[PDB]
Design a binder for this molecule. Sequence first.
Ligand SMILES: [Cl-]
Ligand SMILES: [Zn+2]
Lengths: 4, 267
Amino acid sequence: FSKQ
Amino acid sequence: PSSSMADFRKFFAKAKHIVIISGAGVSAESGVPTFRGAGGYWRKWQAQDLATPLAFAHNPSRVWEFYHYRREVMGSKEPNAGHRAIAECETRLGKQGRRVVVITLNIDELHRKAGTKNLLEIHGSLFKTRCTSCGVVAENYKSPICPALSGKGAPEPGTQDASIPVEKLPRCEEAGCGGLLRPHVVWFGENLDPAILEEVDRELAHCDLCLVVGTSSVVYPAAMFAPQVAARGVPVAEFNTETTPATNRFRFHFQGPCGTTLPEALA
Ligand SMILES: [Cl-]
Ligand SMILES: [Zn+2]
């Protein structure tokens, strides 16, 4: 998952 | 959530597999600058500005100055009472056949410096590089990481950019490559390592107690680890200086600095  | 230390301790005495998720609060307590929300600032930017693929694509010299400064300050920084409580807990419980693992968002390696052995560093490390051409990852502790950065990265506002030509920035020493290196740090908008997330998921799937320490709980996917754990009924205890959007989802919330609450909690 992408780092927000 | 509950704030009964005595109740948490009852779960702690019985837990066989403890996951501890640590974020920027733990590093700030060692006086490490986190460059998020005071913070403070590197000369005119914060981490949201410079820890991005865009910032590295526009001015890799400026990004390297920022990371060089962060590497250098680490010489003056030591693990705090929270790091030490967490490391001692791991050693004490391990002798009893009980498992403690730290899943940290922090990139400063203070958990390792304190002696934590079961550690997943999900956002990388200031002391690792990755080659923008061949992809090799390497440890690097050299001060300075390259001659051109010597004395650079000064943090005071108004400091001129070093403007180091890309060829004088840290370069890959894999024979034949010599590509430009970047810090092996996960930047905003980048995906975390799937192999690391597989490890995280195994720990979350098997733990029977979860602590969330020093985390803003608004950085994803890290903000979502503890919620998936409570789903199996696992108690989650939050240790932070303030509530977060995830606070009402936890079994316990102990307000205060992590270096103040954790020693008692993990005693
Ligand atoms: Cl955090
Ligand atoms: Zn390379």
